[PDB]
Amino acid sequence: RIELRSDITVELVDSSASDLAVVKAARVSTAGEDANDELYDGGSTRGLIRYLMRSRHGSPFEHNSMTFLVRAPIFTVRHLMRHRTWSFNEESARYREVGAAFYVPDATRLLRQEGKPGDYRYVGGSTDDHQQVVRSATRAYEVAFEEYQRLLDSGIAREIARLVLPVSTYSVLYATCNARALMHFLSLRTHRPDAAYVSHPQREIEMVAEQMETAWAKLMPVTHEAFTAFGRVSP
Amino acid sequence: IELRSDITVELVDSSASDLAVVKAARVSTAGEDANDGGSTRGLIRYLMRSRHGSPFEHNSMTFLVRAPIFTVRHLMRHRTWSFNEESARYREVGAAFYVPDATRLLREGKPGDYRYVGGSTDDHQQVVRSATRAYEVAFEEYQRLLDSGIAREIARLVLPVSTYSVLYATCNARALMHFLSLRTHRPDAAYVSHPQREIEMVAEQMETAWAKLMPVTHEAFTAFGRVSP
Amino acid sequence: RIELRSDITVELVDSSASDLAVVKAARVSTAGEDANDELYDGGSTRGLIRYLMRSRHGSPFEHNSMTFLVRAPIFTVRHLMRHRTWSFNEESARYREVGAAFYVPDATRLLRQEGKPGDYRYVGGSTDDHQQVVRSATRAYEVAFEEYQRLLDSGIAREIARLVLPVSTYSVLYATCNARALMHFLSLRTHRPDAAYVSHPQREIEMVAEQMETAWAKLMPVTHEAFTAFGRVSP
Amino acid sequence: IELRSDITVELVDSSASDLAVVKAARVSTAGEDANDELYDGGSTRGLIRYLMRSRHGSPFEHNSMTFLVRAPIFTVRHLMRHRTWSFNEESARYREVGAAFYVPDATRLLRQEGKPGDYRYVGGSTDDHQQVVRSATRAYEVAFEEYQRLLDSGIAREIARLVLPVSTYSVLYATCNARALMHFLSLRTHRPDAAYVSHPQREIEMVAEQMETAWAKLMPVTHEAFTAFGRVSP
Ligand SMILES: Cc1cc2nc3c(=O)[nH]c(=O)nc-3n(C[C@H](O)[C@H](O)[C@H](O)COP(=O)(O)OP(=O)(O)OC[C@H]3O[C@@H](n4cnc5c(N)ncnc54)[C@H](O)[C@@H]3O)c2cc1C
Ligand SMILES: Cc1cc2nc3c(=O)[nH]c(=O)nc-3n(C[C@H](O)[C@H](O)[C@H](O)COP(=O)(O)OP(=O)(O)OC[C@H]3O[C@@H](n4cnc5c(N)ncnc54)[C@H](O)[C@@H]3O)c2cc1C
Numbered sequence: 001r002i003e004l005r006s007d008i009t010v011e012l013v014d015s016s017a018s019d020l021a022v023v024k025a026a027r028v029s030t031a032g033e034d035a036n037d038e039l040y041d042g043g044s045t046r047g048l049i050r051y052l053m054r055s056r057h058g059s060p061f062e063h064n065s066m067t068f069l070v071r072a073p074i075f076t077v078r079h080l081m082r083h084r085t086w087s088f089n090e091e092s093a094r095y096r097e098v099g100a101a102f103y104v105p106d107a108t109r110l111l112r113q114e115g116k117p118g119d120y121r122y123v124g125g126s127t128d129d130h131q132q133v134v135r136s137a138t139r140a141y142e143v144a145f146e147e148y149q150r151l152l153d154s155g156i157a158r159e160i161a162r163l164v165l166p167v168s169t170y171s172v173l174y175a176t177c178n179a180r181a182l183m184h185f186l187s188l189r190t191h192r193p194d195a196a197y198v199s200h201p202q203r204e205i206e207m208v209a210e211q212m213e214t215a216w217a218k219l220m221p222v223t224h225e226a227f228t229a230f231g232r233v234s235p
Numbered sequence: 236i237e238l239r240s241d242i243t244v245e246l247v248d249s250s251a252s253d254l255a256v257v258k259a260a261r262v263s264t265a266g267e268d269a270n271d272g273g274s275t276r277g278l279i280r281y282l283m284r285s286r287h288g289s290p291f292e293h294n295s296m297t298f299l300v301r302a303p304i305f306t307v308r309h310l311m312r313h314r315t316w317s318f319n320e321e322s323a324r325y326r327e328v329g330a331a332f333y334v335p336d337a338t339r340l341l342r343e344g345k346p347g348d349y350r351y352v353g354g355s356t357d358d359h360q361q362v363v364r365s366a367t368r369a370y371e372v373a374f375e376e377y378q379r380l381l382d383s384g385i386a387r388e389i390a391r392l393v394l395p396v397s398t399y400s401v402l403y404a405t406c407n408a409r410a411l412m413h414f415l416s417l418r419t420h421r422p423d424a425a426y427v428s429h430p431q432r433e434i435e436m437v438a439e440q441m442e443t444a445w446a447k448l449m450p451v452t453h454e455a456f457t458a459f460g461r462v463s464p
Numbered sequence: 465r466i467e468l469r470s471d472i473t474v475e476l477v478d479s480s481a482s483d484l485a486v487v488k489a490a491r492v493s494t495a496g497e498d499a500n501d502e503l504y505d506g507g508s509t510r511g512l513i514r515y516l517m518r519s520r521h522g523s524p525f526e527h528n529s530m531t532f533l534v535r536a537p538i539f540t541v542r543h544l545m546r547h548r549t550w551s552f553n554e555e556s557a558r559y560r561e562v563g564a565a566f567y568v569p570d571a572t573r574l575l576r577q578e579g580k581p582g583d584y585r586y587v588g589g590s591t592d593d594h595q596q597v598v599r600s601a602t603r604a605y606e607v608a609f610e611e612y613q614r615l616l617d618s619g620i621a622r623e624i625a626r627l628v629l630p631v632s633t634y635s636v637l638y639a640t641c642n643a644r645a646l647m648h649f650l651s652l653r654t655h656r657p658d659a660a661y662v663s664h665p666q667r668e669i670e671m672v673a674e675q676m677e678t679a680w681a682k683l684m685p686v687t688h689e690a691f692t693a694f695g696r697v698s699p
Numbered sequence: 700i701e702l703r704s705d706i707t708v709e710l711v712d713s714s715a716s717d718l719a720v721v722k723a724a725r726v727s728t729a730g731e732d733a734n735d736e737l738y739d740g741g742s743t744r745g746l747i748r749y750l751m752r753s754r755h756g757s758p759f760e761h762n763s764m765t766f767l768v769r770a771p772i773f774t775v776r777h778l779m780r781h782r783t784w785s786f787n788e789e790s791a792r793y794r795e796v797g798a799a800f801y802v803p804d805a806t807r808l809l810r811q812e813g814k815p816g817d818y819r820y821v822g823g824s825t826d827d828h829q830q831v832v833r834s835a836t837r838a839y840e841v842a843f844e845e846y847q848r849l850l851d852s853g854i855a856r857e858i859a860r861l862v863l864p865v866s867t868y869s870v871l872y873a874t875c876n877a878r879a880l881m882h883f884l885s886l887r888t889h890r891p892d893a894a895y896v897s898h899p900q901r902e903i904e905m906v907a908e909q910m911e912t913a914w915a916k917l918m919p920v921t922h923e924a925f926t927a928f929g930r931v932s933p
């Protein structure tokens with residue numbers, strides 16, 4: 001028996017990110033060695049960071065890291081993993097038997113399907129779909145996992161047996177970035193009609209991106225607001 | 236549906252030669268002067284053994300790759316490459332699926348355990364038959380979701396990781412060597428890696444094409460233990 | 465016996481860069497295998513490249529390379545080597561006796577000096593500045609080069625003798641990028657009031673950038689034109 | 700003007716421990732359950748050695764270390780060739796340069812290299828130190844004197860600096876993860892015992908040594924493995 005889930009989760013597992021890190025790093029360029037010591041307050045912090053954001057001076061946002069634990073279907077992990085300045089370590093289906101958790105969209109998700117990303121007329125759907133999707137998914141997931149279990153039972157290599165598993169199978173990974181890589185990622189992986197360049201990601205990676213953005217907002221409140229302020233363009 | 240076991244790589248564009256390496260390396264010792272066969276062979280052997288990899292980066296190779304998604308995930312972990320890949324969010328995907336061929340060992344059960352490696356050919360028929368039921372049902376349902384007006388990006392959730400995809404993949408020679416050290420199983424190498432056979436097929440095809448472009452670099456690569464400089 | 469020059473030179477030595485490669489790379493997404501054997505006409509090329517440029521879809525612009533031979537002052541080479549997606553190989557002063565060639569800015573250049581980059585009110589300059597710079601530079605360079613040779617004559621290692629040499633000493637290097645990295649470089653290393661983000665690079669690095677742009681314009685005229693139509697923002 | 704021979708590195712921030720390695724590696728083999736349970740020094744060391752010996756590099760990337768570095772420009776150029784790092788450096792286009800310049804100390808000059816990579820080109824002596832100090836003093840004094848005359852003439856900071864030598868001190872922040880740091884140590888330390896002998900100049904190697912010490916304090920199991928296996932980055 002399989003488990004169907006529709007939750008996509010991100011947990012902040014570790015970090016070293018602050019708005020002060022950014023101020024210090026940027027100060028060294030005009031201040032020299034005073035940089036590491038100086039008297040910088042609430043209003044000077046806002047001012048400097050907004051300025052770096054508006055000028056796209058991005059390197060001072062690199063002196064940090066945030067590490068997330070992500071649990072998501074493989075098709076969404078494929079989206080996250082396209083971001084080449086991040087580091088990733090993922091559960092391996094060559095090394096382990098895969099758990100029978102599979103992703104299905106929730107009812108309320110399906111009313112926001114993008115038939116051809118970037119085109120307005122292709123957004124829509126309604127919730128007779130959800131039952132049809134649940135019904136199709138259940139049949140395909142069951143068979144795949146049963147054939148999966150069957151080959152493992154004959155002693156077929158796990159890396160071969162998994163060929164039958166759907167891209168909706170859940171995976172778990174660690175994902176580490178600095179703030180600049182995170183802002184570049186948010187620019188592409190959130191849909192924000194406010195933004196200078198509006199992106200059209202699938203909703204499931206956007207779910208990942210929003211949770212990450214919430215955790216990041218707490219660590220770097222001033223950077224986060226400035227990022228939104230300047231049109232969600234990565235410095 | 237179609238079942239297939241080809242995994243193909245074609246070189247589609249390049250600007251890559253051994254001489255491009257020699258010139259790049261020679262600005263250092265010679266300056267402007269830098270812009271035979273034995274000084275080329277010599278210089279390249281030295282850069283390889285000293286691990287001066289920067290001269291090997293002044294070049295590009297582009298490949299067109301046809302492989303199932305699980306192997307494409309392997310390829311796309313190499314972050315210094317450039318990729319563009321067929322999208323199931325935009326396209327209705329083709330009913331082509333990978334199954335291993337007859338000569339594939341079917342029993343590495345934990346890679347790096349050359350105690351967990353083996354196989355037979357009654358395993359073959361089992362794999363094919365069993366994958367076939369999985370793929371058939373997945374595709375039928377993928378079609379029924381499309382036919383009900385479900386968006387492509389959602390319909391595809393039911394497709395296995397053995398679905399064929401296709402992409403352009405571009406690297407310089409230094410990134411390729413790094414890729415080859417990880418993505419071929421070569422007990423003769425200084426550091427032995429244990430890649431899945433399917434990505435290794437990709438890798439062998441790329442190495443073969445690259446040997447035609449840069450045969451002296453390819454020889455030095457192997458001579459010094461298949462360690463990327 | 466020193467030589468003063470004020471020419472910063474870029475030569476394209478090799479490339480494999482075209483607009484058509486960009487189209488193929490984008491078409492694989494929507495057309496699959498067929499993209500590799502498709503024929504593309506002028507208007508479909510233009511429409512597609514302008515679409516990617518304005519949408520900031522940048523990956524299709526990476527399947528190429530350009531290799532430049534660059535001769536420039538150290539201080540300008542440092543600007544150029546800040547760009548981490550490039551490949552560089554540079555003449556070594558640890559290995560080679562350095563040539564007596566040093567950069568001075570020419571008279572036209574000095575009219576457009578940047579006192580506080582980004583601040584337009586420290587932009588400017590006089591006509592007699594050229595003579596004061598030349599008289600000042602020539603004295604300092606002569607002494608550095610003379611001490612350099614003295615150190616070399618006393619058997620001091622080249623790696624140590626060169627500490628007396630100025631940031632205006634000429635170096636030579638190969639610099640290799642793809643068009644996307646070149647574009648991000650041009651958005652930062654050229655000053656353009658038309659641009660969506662006006663940058664304030666030292667004129668010396670900008671001279672490097674303009675010549676790269678000219679050579680690249682010839683290889684990928686469609687992309688070039690599109691990059692400029694949409695405000696010099698790197699996809 | 701002030702002549703110095705110190706090259707300093709200070710750790711100003713980090714999030715790095717051997718623990719972030721074990722967790723990142725454990726996800727692959729034990730899934731979700733690798734964030735959340737049984738941890739053991741022996742098994743932690745055996746896993747880190749195994750990743751190191753096998754060059755499984757990626758689990759060593761979930762961390763960061765930020766160094767504040769003060770070093771002459773010619774050394775900064777060596778450090779900044781490592782493109783996986785992030786840097787922010789004092790700008791001479793924005794700032795009047797301080798007249799601090801590097802001269803090698805007396806012991807260092809006894810080493811000097813070549814031609815780097817040839818054993819028989821290493822040498823020096825202690826009236827050579829006084830040559831170096833005297834030539835340097837003459838060059839730097841004139842450079843700084845011209846620098847000032849140009850600034851006094853209202854010539855722009857960015858142009859005036861053309862006269863200053865590559866021995867001018869600069870200050871920067873440098874952030875990397877432990878995988879990038881290992882690669883940098885492999886190339887920027889000279890260790891006849893390593894699987895690959897590298898021949899960096901002494902000054903960047905003085906930067907490297909201090910970074911290694913600071914890192915080893917944070918990740919001693921990783922550092923012991925790095926060294927045990929020939930100082931090859933995973
Ligand atoms: C047998 C095998 C098993 C594997 N097992 C797993 C697994 O179980 N789970 C999993 O997630 N992955 C696994 N991987 C994938 C692996 O962790 C890498 O993602 C992939 O192999 C490519 O690694 P790479 O970074 O060395 O090369 P690429 O990312 O091209 O990077 C090339 C080199 O670039 C440098 N580099 C680039 N970016 C950085 C950076 N940000 N920091 C430091 N250095 C950088 C490094 O020196 C690196 O060696 C496995 C790979 C193999 C061959
Ligand atoms: C709506 C949407 C649609 C997409 N469509 C497709 C698709 O149809 N097909 C497909 O294959 N992918 C697609 N992608 C993925 C896309 O092609 C990117 O690889 C992904 O968005 C990550 O972007 P990136 O390459 O800008 O950033 P990452 O690879 O981190 O790189 C980040 C930034 O680093 C720089 N950079 C890193 N490496 C290089 C390099 N080698 N050269 C130059 N600059 C570099 C660039 O400035 C880049 O913007 C899509 C993404 C979105 C949000």
Ligand SMILES: Cc1cc2nc3c(=O)[nH]c(=O)nc-3n(C[C@H](O)[C@H](O)[C@H](O)COP(=O)(O)OP(=O)(O)OC[C@H]3O[C@@H](n4cnc5c(N)ncnc54)[C@H](O)[C@@H]3O)c2cc1C
Pocket residue numbers: 263264287288289290292315407409410413464549550551552553554555556780781782783784815879882886887897898899
């Ligand atoms: C003794 C010595 C002598 C040297 N001689 C010279 C010289 O004469 N001239 C000169 O210019 N430099 C010289 N260098 C500098 C050298 O060429 C490198 O720029 C510097 O050593 C940083 O090394 P790196 O590129 O391997 O690592 P970093 O750039 O962190 O890169 C780490 C790893 O990332 C990967 N990587 C990152 N970007 C790319 C990319 N675009 N393509 C492929 N892989 C990538 C590679 O796998 C690389 O090894 C020398 C260095 C040493 C230690």
Ligand SMILES: Cc1cc2nc3c(=O)[nH]c(=O)nc-3n(C[C@H](O)[C@H](O)[C@H](O)COP(=O)(O)OP(=O)(O)OC[C@H]3O[C@@H](n4cnc5c(N)ncnc54)[C@H](O)[C@@H]3O)c2cc1C
Pocket residue numbers: 029030057058059062085178180181184235546547548549550581648652653663664665783784785786787788789790
């Ligand atoms: C007018 C001007 C003023 C400047 N002022 C200063 C100054 O005062 N002090 C100073 O030190 N420098 C200064 N710089 C240099 C600047 O900080 C950058 O190093 C330089 O512009 C290189 O471009 P880049 O860092 O945006 O991207 P480059 O390193 O090419 O990289 C391209 C893209 O790759 C991505 N990327 C690559 N590596 C990482 C990583 N490790 N983490 C996250 N993302 C990554 C980013 O998305 C980045 O934009 C200035 C440049 C200009 C034009």
Ligand SMILES: O=c1[nH]c(=O)n([C@H]2C[C@H](O)[C@@H](COP(=O)(O)O)O2)cc1Br
Pocket residue numbers: 090091092093094095305308309310312346429430431
């Ligand atoms: O040999 C491997 N190659 C590889 O690239 N991975 C990466 C790919 C993917 O992001 C994740 C899991 O892959 P498998 O499910 O193929 O292990 O780790 C893992 C192994 Br083991």
Ligand SMILES: O=c1[nH]c(=O)n([C@H]2C[C@H](O)[C@@H](COP(=O)(O)O)O2)cc1Br
Pocket residue numbers: 075078079080082117200201202320321322323324325
């Ligand atoms: O929104 C997208 N996000 C994405 O990352 N890709 C990348 C991921 C994968 O390597 C390939 C195809 O993905 P889909 O099958 O998710 O389109 O392109 C494509 C699209 Br469209």
Ligand SMILES: O=c1[nH]c(=O)n([C@H]2C[C@H](O)[C@@H](COP(=O)(O)O)O2)cc1Br
Pocket residue numbers: 554555556557558559773776777778780815898899900
């Ligand atoms: O040991 C070296 N370290 C180094 O980083 N380079 C790089 C730095 C610079 O960009 C160029 C030449 O510097 P020297 O002039 O410092 O060799 O090559 C060269 C040598 Br040799």
Ligand SMILES: O=c1[nH]c(=O)n([C@H]2C[C@H](O)[C@@H](COP(=O)(O)O)O2)cc1Br
Pocket residue numbers: 539542543544546581664665666788789790791792793
């Ligand atoms: O316009 C700039 N371009 C640049 O690349 N830098 C980087 C390069 C160098 O590493 C450091 C100091 O450069 P000047 O010394 O040119 O400011 O910051 C700074 C400025 Br401002």
